[PDB]
Each structure stands twice: as structure tokens, then as C-alpha cells.
Amino acid sequence: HSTAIGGVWLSVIFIFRIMVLVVAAESVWGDEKSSFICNTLQ
Amino acid sequence: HSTAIGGVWLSVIFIFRIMVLVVAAESVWGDEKSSFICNTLQ
């Protein structure tokens, strides 16, 4: 059995989190290391 | 009049200082600024 109070909202929010992570990881966090720069010659 | 105790030694030591400065300034201190380098990109 399933409960509409918990199951449906959990599934939709989990799908929303998947979509948000897919949007973020590809573009926002892609150049997190390559664009990282420090003011030094070392 | 002159005194051999002070005048001769003063003159020879002053000439020695001139020669030492001539030797030092041309070569030793020539690249004091151009060779000065700091570990920074600023």
C-alpha cells in the first residue's frame, strides 16, 4: 500500500532534485577547477 | 703644514675607498633592481 501524503510528494521532490542537479552539474560546476586561479607564480 | 700621521693615511684610505666603490658599483650593484624578483603575479 501507499500513502498520498508522503509518497507522491517525496517522488516529485526527488525528481525535482534530480533535474536541478542535472542542470547544475553540467554547466555551473563544470569549470570549478579549470577556472580556479590563485595570485602566485608558485 | 701637514702631518704624516693623519694626512697620508687619510689620503691613501680615501683613494682605496674610491677604488673599492668603482669596482663595486659597476658590476655588483648594477642589476640590483632588474634581477630583483618576487613570487607573485601582481
Swiss-Prot record, chains A, B:
It is found in: Cell membrane; Cell junction, Gap junction. Changing residue 19 to V: In CMTX1; localized in the Golgi apparatus but also forming rare small gap junction-like plaques. Changing residue 19 to K: In CMTX1; localized to the endoplasmic reticulum. Changing residue 23 to M: In CMTX1; localized in the Golgi apparatus without reaching the cell membrane. Changing residue 38 to S: In CMTX1; suggests a failure to incorporate the mutant protein in the cell membrane. The chain crosses the membrane at residues 8-30. One gap junction consists of a cluster of closely packed pairs of transmembrane channels, the connexons, through which materials of low MW diffuse from one cell to a neighboring cell. A connexon is composed of a hexamer of connexins. Interacts with CNST. Belongs to the connexin family. Beta-type (group I) subfamily. It is linked to Charcot-Marie-Tooth disease, X-linked dominant, 1: A form of Charcot-Marie-Tooth disease, a disorder of the peripheral nervous system, characterized by progressive weakness and atrophy, initially of the peroneal muscles and later of the distal muscles of the arms. This is Gap junction beta-1 protein. The lineage of its organism: Eukaryota, Metazoa, Chordata, Craniata, Vertebrata.
